[PDB]
Amino acid sequence: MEEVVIAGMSGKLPESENLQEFWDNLIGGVDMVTDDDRRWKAGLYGLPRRSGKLKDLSRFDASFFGVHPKQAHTMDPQLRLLLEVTYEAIVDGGINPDSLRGTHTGVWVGVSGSETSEALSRDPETLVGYSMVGCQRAMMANRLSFFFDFRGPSIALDTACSSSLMALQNAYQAIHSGQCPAAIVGGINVLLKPNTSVQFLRLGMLSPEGTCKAFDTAGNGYCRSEGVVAVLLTKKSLARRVYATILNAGTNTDGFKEQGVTFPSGDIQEQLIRSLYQSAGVAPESFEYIEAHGTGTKVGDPQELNGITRALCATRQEPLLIGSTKSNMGHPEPASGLAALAKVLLSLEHGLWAPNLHFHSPNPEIPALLDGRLQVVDQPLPVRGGNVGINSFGFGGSNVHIILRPNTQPPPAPAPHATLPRLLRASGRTPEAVQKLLEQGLRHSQDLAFLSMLNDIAAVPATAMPFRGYAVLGGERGGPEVQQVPAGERPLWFICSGMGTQWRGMGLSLMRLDRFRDSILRSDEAVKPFGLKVSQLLLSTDESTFDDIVHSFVSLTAIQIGLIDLLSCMGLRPDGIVGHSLGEVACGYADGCLSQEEAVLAAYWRGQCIKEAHLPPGAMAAVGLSWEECKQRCPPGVVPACHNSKDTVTISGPQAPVFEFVEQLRKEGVFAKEVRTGGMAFHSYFMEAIAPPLLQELKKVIREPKPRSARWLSTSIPEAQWHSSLARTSSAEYNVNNLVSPVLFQEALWHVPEHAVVLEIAPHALLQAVLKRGLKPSCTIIPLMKKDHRDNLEFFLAGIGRLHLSGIDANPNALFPPVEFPAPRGTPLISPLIKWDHSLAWDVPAAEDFPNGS
Amino acid sequence: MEEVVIAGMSGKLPESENLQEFWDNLIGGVDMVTDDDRRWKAGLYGLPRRSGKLKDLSRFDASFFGVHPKQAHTMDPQLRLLLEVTYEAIVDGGINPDSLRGTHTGVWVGVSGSETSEALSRDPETLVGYSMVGCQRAMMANRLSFFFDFRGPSIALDTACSSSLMALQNAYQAIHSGQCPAAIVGGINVLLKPNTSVQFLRLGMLSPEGTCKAFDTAGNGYCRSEGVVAVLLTKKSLARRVYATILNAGTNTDGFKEQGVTFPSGDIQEQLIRSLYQSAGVAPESFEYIEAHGTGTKVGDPQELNGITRALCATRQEPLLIGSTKSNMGHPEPASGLAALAKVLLSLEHGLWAPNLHFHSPNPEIPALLDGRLQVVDQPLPVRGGNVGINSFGFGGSNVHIILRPNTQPPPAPAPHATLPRLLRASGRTPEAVQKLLEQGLRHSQDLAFLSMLNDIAAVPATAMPFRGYAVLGGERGGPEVQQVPAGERPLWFICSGMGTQWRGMGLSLMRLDRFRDSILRSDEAVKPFGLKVSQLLLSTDESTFDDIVHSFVSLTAIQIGLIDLLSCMGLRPDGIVGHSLGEVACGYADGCLSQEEAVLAAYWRGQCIKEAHLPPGAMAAVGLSWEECKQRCPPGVVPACHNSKDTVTISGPQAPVFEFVEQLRKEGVFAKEVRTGGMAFHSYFMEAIAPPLLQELKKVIREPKPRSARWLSTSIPEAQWHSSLARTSSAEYNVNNLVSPVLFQEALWHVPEHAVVLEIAPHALLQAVLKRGLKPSCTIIPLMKKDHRDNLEFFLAGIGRLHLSGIDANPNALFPPVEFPAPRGTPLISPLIKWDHSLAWDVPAAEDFPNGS
């Protein structure tokens, strides 16, 4: 009752390390079968010289899959290759494999031989026990279920040549019945000992020329080949990527035949095909292509093709295209179904049917090839539309047939959010893997679904993949950044600065993000009744607006609240919060003890009470003196205000004490930074009378307060008063004490741990130099906005990107509108982009480890 | 949506050639594991000396399964044994295998090793191609599907130790979904090369003592064993025999474990058990026995038993019985599930739980064994009632569990038809097989369901099983009769005699049969209005009744019609019909051109017209003269009447011509048999006037006649008049010509073919001596009734029995009321009663055909 789709694909086929190399060789018309001594001699025992073999067989990333190096040498090579391509298939689906770690997904593998098992057990005096664990035929599925933590059925089955498609049929029935949510289908074949080829030669099944002349007059046998293929099957609701939908799948057996056990029977195959499409409810006119078994034998090809033309070409009125990938590749026996399925799905993805090789004249015993009812694809011709049938028949008599419907999702309509720059994060075992992923993301910068699945597969722990990277796409600067991430957990800390950081155009560039704009409009409707709206303070800003201190207060708190909201939808939960005056006001929303409206009205009421009453113009000169030397060198009535660092302390007072330290700024090395904000002496004794009018207004907004958390480190309260009744809750008296007390921004900074990642929440990171000398040198400081930046959205996205390079997982897909659930076809492949650590070589059995009759 | 039942069982286990030998060894407490050099040496390579092995491995009936003797030598022995036990399982179900020849039944076999394949391919210069066909792992299922002509899925699967029960689980899902009507589940394991045992020894899994000390403190490993088991699964409506009903079946996998791939996890097993019974809807209180995996390892037994006591023994209030057949037998790896299932089903059939061996003290790490919540069966204790759970866990991590409910059908209530004698037919390859079946049927003569399934499995062609036999059970004579049947088809011919064969008590003994009594009452209601009823002519017969000729006529035709009805429900369709006067009247009902009422009224009207008019008393003297000499030696007005043979001709005439040939009977060798029937000259010139009154009455009964068939050979019409208008239909003029013409019973007999089987339909076979000298000597004449026989039902059943020995298939189950569809439990097993032609020895690989490190 559930729809079953094909979600992922990966493979290793002759002269085809990756699935793309496979496709290229297939459409290139290259003879992937070769005459090389890569496994045994050229023509020993009278064997054919030509065979299809894999490029390499001794490469395995043993540390990733957690196998001991002594156990990896005594493993079946086909199991090592199956582990790697099984990871690559899940990643090709767009699914992180960690989301299937407890589920009931099953594994079905089609194998037919275990030659490594009998090569590794020839000497009973030097045996090891690990050869049983790494080479037994059930372990080809059980090791996959063990590593990927799969709780479903784990079966290895052998059904001769139809073994791989039979596994697909059983996995189909498991998903269809609701037993399993997902499944993995595999198929493996490796040619190691020549005695099996001598057996097939004496049976009469091997061509002397080593060629599958499919549907040809000169066909006299097949050519043996290798291959390791895996696909990922899932229900429709879990699929990020869809290649095709399996309409139906079934099987039968020939039964008794007078001719023999080996001989094919086309009547039972015709019955299987007709019963399948009937039960599926599809008309035979709707087909356009059928991938035949097509092994090239003398008696098998007319039986199969006459069965096809009886079941399908009765009342059709159109030619039916037919092909066979064994003419391009050779015939891997238990892995022939998934290799043909890979060719079909690659042909559907690229829009062109891959041609057949070695087809010159039709077989005269097949009359449908002579009048045009069946047409062999011998040239590349485009895909028009309809269903594709795939059948594979074993020589024992097992018949399997699949009907699948390709997906035809068009590329989406253009949208105004598609012009915004995006983030792309990557991970890998080596720097080259991260470079490959980032450069392929740069090549396809306008493909939104491709970037979404690439961002989805990047959340791997640093112990598994120790190299991470990022690149900002769609911007003007660009540039991949790759570095090695240290292992372990690093705490994330939030620091939000105070006043003096406003400018012309605060956060406009990232007003294009929807969630930031929603937060800004929420703060707008909150201050709307109070004769104010921060939207004109954002868009219609000139120099007559931010010299006011009320507008500066609300335009600081709203921007910090919007940044915290963006970080909260990002998935990030802070471990420690420490602010600075109005930053400490926004720390209430950062901690959750405040909400939007109370924070914005508290900031506006602070500004309103300050602008209501009037006190002598104040100063904020900054001097190059410590905290203790400033108390003894100020005149009476002049108080130190800000304890930023051990060398930077801000003084507060009137103009004549400000003019007093102009002369002492000439003396020695003393800073003469006299930056003021409206000429008002915040954090001073001049506002001891400001609090009682202000406190009255506040009690009407932050009534029934909530207690502060242990993560919030207070900066207006000294350390010995942290347990008092005033500093447990974020009440109205807590906020008015912030204005009348000096900010202690040094003793809060020494409680930050050793390897913390510090995020600065400010419209301009002017506290970055203070935090560098004020914190431990094993900390990372990341700014989020920069004053007078042309595209501040690119600056924000680079901060999120280097947050990925520190070790904190943060998915930038949540910032943008989500992509529709089926990806459109023609989306680029992901499984060729995965690279492993292949610096080591492992043991492979040779031809001398098998009995030669000596 | 369909109920799945276990219908058949067969097996070959250590020291257990048949399933009964297995049961005996199991309850006998015999250690089926031995220390003999039956496969390799005693303790070479440091291997344990003890192992469980089959009794013989080189026996195969190659001609029955149609394999060439050169192909049989290069076959896997385990496939040969699987073919034989697969036939035995179907026969044990009570089902003829020919009724599944076109159906969609599937085959699932659990294998794990193919050592014969690598022993037969060691020399690439002397290879043969047949070793691929007979030893490839897919062929273990494909050869079964090929021989038995099965169209369903044919899969060989390997899932380590749980491989046999996994096949049962998949076959369960196929029947449950409605995909398959029936299925065959197999499991095979054979120990041939010692290198695999050395691998298991180095892994640490083998006990040094070669003992499975299940649930014991001293358990340190398992003992390797052999075994070939097959069961037959079917839907409920097809089952003649039910062992149990599968309530539920399922599987899962352990997934990732910190301890390793090999280590068992009881938590996932507990989850599987709890999910199964929940989905099945059965309470955990309803269980009474669970067959554990019970391999005897140090860390596996506490994990499995603690998982069982968490899933099952939470709120139970009763002890739960637990056992393990591996303590009796050893551990066959991929065939452990079906062997345990065989032990459980044998224990349910015999009413006693088979005890465990080698259990002395409980494992201290299992606290449920120390307080009584789990109880080990170490003594034979009776079966009380409830469900039985069977689980088998592979060492790769595959977990499978079965819930099955035993059938508790009581033996039926006694009935009056159970005292009647029955027929039992048998077939076999040898005379000893037929003798075994007949003597086991004699031992259980009162078991009706057992005899019904034995009669059902006996319909095999003579080319397959050339020895047939029969025995009449419940009679007083008895005696098995065994002979060799000649091959080919033999035509069946019906001959029904005329008058002069009546006696006192015609057919009474077989009035107890229901269909004969129904035919008699149908003829009774037909003649009821005509002031007659043949029931008092049957029961209330004395010597004042059958001296009348009307009663003799109806009591001949009714008995012959009832015999023909019994033969028609028997399944038999005649090839040639030839009668004799009133026999030729009953030939109309034999041919189908007449019905019951027309035949009975025609016979009664012949008698009524004969008894109406009166003619001079006639004679039927019989003389020892030929047909031509009788015409020249009779006086004028005296006509020869019956041409029985070349030496026997009946004369017809008055008393004074009858007295004339008394004197000539003294002369030479002339018979003086003057037997008359009422003193009336039938087949003579004295009844030329009898026909016109008779014809008038007949036109009112056999109005609108039907044409005679080519099988009916006329005896009142000469050969040259066979195409005339009088002899094409069985009209009223056809019957009145029978009375006025001589019967030509010789020229009809020369048209009978060479090897015909002749059946005599008469209440007393007085024509048996005539047919012996009148027919060819290659014909068999079978009488059906004998005059003055004490039990004529035993005489009829012996005729049907020797009809089976001729070659004609005839099932005597149709004569009696049918047996209810589920057979009651305790019905004797059938699969130990099948014997083969095992006079030849085939090749088995030795230990020297494997690499020893030389």
Residue numbers in the entry:
A (entry chain B), B (entry chain A): 1 to 854
Paper quotes:
In mammals, fatty acid synthase (FASN) contains multiple enzymatic domains to catalyse all chemical reactions needed for de novo fatty acid synthesis. In metazoans, all essential enzymes are included in a single polypeptide chain and are arranged into two main functional domains, each carrying out a key chemical process and named correspondingly the condensing and modifying domains. The entire cycle of fatty acid synthesis requires that ACP carries the substrate from one enzyme to another repeatedly. Here, using a strategy of tagging and purifying endogenous FASN in HEK293T cells for single-particle cryo-electron microscopy studies, we characterized the structural dynamics of endogenous human FASN.
Focusing on these subsets, we refined the condensing and modifying wings separately to high resolutions with the best to 2.5 Å and 2.7 Å, respectively, from the 1,3-DBP sample. From these two separate reconstructions, we generated a composite map of human FASN incubated with 1,3-DBP, in which an ACP is seen bound to the KS domain. This composite map is of sufficient quality for accurate modelling of most of the modifying and condensing wings. In all of these groups, the catalytic cavities of KS and MAT are well resolved. Notably, we observed that small molecules, orlistat or 1,3-DBP, do not alter the overall shapes of the conformational landscapes but generate a few hotspots within the central region.
